[PDB]
Enzyme design. Structure first.
Site, PDB file in Angstrom:
ATOM      1  N   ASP A   1     -10.381   5.009  14.444  1.00 58.45           N
ATOM      2  CA  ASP A   1     -10.631   5.037  13.030  1.00 58.45           C
ATOM      3  C   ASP A   1     -10.510   3.811  12.465  1.00 58.45           C
TER       4      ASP A   1
ATOM      5  N   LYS B   1       0.756  -1.156   0.014  1.00 53.74           N
ATOM      6  CA  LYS B   1      -0.117  -0.066   0.057  1.00 53.74           C
ATOM      7  C   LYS B   1       0.934   1.270   0.015  1.00 53.74           C
TER       8      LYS B   1
END
Ligand code: CXC
Ligand code: CX0
Lengths: 313, 302
Positions: B234, B109
């Site tokens: 989150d 990523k």
């Protein structure tokens, strides 16, 4: 399997890291059908800034530059040298003795100047052409690699060659033959002196190699020095080493209290056995050295060849 | 001969760099323990080739590896051999910024500067947690963090182990974290990331049994308690469903739990025969109460 690159001075550790790195990189590059002209102008450059990392034996900061790696890879091949062998000789263990050989006495590393690198470049294309036209059979230096090292901001140029001397046979006497020069008393009184021209003529040493050997040798030397003249090069010398078979036979046993004169032409390529009918059993190593220098170079060719003719039987 | 041939040049550099660093690392001994400097350390190499090896690589590029001793050790603690890691990144270019290795084993990523900062803020406590739970954990498994510079522009990347099977096609995806749902836009792709609400609407359940569910819950609780104790929030839970029978249209619903480490077979008493993959994701963006609500959500799904 783990290469530590441990060495007495950091530059040698960088040398080992660099030859290992470049040979590994070279192993992922295919082998070309022929060299292209760009291969003769190329370079590889790497710059390492480690930090709190891998500092045991290498610097944290250093640079390594290799010149014309496609070319010297091809030379390596044309001289019968395997890349894996080359890298191992340089990296299994630190080189020794600026002037060095690899631990296995197989290759020599010389520090050299910017200018020497320049001249090597000016001549490289014609030199590779010469090497290939003679299938690697030459008494000239066999250049296997040229590198530039930067450590503590200081650049250091190095040229790798095949050793003239046998990597196993002890060398007992040395001469550097090219006016009239002789060995200083300073040099004359050290461990193994480089005895110049005058001392060789004073001593009256001759080399008894046998007719066939002598002829192949002189034909080879004539081709070579004519090449050097045609490249307008001079001040080169012929390096000569003598191995005394019987003395070696003694010392390998004198240390034991605490084949003889046999060698491999695939490895000791400048070696020659003494004639069967010779005073003593000797092995000789003879090759040209010191050709990156650039009174007349044509006269150099002629005088050099006549001298070296008159030192053989 | 590794040519490093890749779809975009940045992928060539990724392959060259992981190859380079893993090879270098193989000459660095394995230490008795990690030291604090290992958590501040880095490797940096800069390449200016010329008329040389330009077929697949650039002539000028830079490659930086963060904390190479740590991530090597993590790799070991996650059961991952360095030579395997290197082959998955280099035997063939990665694929589809979001990437996997050709062999679908690891995910690469792109991440932000800040994400790199955060990874650093957490790395020692994270590594310590990894070792304390012998690697049996549902948190992302960080295997390497690298910075790439090509045409003077830097690109940051974190390599982690994939959640899904590297062989089994996964059929449906849910991302569970208020109220979030899948847009008509997202809903109209091949495999949508269906957010929290749409999975509850769909009424899919996951039947892992009791013992499986129980040990799973123990692990999920450990992880979110850690993330809370580090004031992280989150984060999301990623879950993928493989319906063997759809695949029927060598082995069916067969996998190696040593390789697909997040996989679970369905209970014999299940609607369909399914294989499920579940793990936590996106834990680099820095209340605690999030831990409690999240774990409660995940509670009522077994
Ligand atoms: N005939 C010829 N052809 C070449 N292809 C060639 N190449 C180099 N030489 C010479 O040696 C130095 C090489 O390092 P260079 O100095 O070039 O290395 P570079 O310039 O990258 O780094 P620096 O500026 O930090 O030193 C040069 O200054 C020259 O004196 C060359 N000579
Ligand atoms: N055994 C062996 N094998 C080689 N391949 C080899 N190559 C160069 N030498 C050395 O070159 C040195 C002089 O080197 P030279 O070029 O005259 O430069 P200077 O020292 O005068 O500046 C000689 O003393 C040799 O020891 C070699 N020795």
């Amino acid at each position: 399997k783990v290469k530590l690159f441990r060495a007495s001075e950091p530059i040698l550790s960088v040398l080992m890291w660099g030859v290992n790195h470049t040979i590994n990189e070279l192993s992922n590059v295919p082998v070309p059908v022929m060299l292209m002209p760009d291969d003769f102008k190329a370079y590889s450059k790497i710059k390492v800034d480690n930090h709190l990392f891998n500092k045991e034996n290498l610097p944290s900061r250093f640079k390594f530059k290799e010149y014309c790696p496609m070319v010297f890879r091809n030379l390596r091949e044309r001289f019968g040298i395997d890349d894996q062998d080359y890298q191992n000789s340089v990296t299994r263990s630190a080189p020794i003795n600026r002037f060095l050989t690899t631990y296995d006495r197989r290759f020599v590393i010389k520090t050299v100047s910017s200018e020497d690198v320049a001249e090597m470049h000016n001549i490289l294309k014609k030199y590779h052409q010469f090497i290939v036209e003679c299938h690697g059979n030459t008494l000239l230096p066999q250049f296997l690699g040229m590198y530039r090292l930067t450590v503590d901001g200081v650049e250091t140029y190095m040229v790798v060659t095949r050793n003239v001397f046998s990597h196993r046979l002890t060398v007992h006497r040395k001469y550097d033959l090219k006016v009239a020069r002789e060995a200083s008393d300073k040099e004359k009184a050290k461990d193994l002196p480089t005895f110049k021209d005058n001392d060789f003529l004073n001593e009256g040493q001759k080399l008894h190699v046998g007719e066939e050997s002598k002829k192949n040798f002189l034909e080879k030397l004539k081709r070579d020095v004519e090449f050097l003249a045609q490249l307008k090069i001079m001040d080169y010398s012929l390096l000569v080493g003598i191995h005394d078979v019987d003395r070696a036979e003694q010392e390998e046993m004198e240390v034991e209290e605490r084949g003889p004169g046999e060698f491999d032409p695939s490895v000791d390529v400048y070696a020659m056995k003494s004639h069967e009918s010779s005073p003593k059993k000797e092995v000789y190593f003879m090759a040209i050295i010191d050709i990156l220098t650039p009174v007349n170079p044509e006269q150099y060719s002629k005088r050099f060849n006549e001298f070296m003719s008159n030192i053989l039987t």
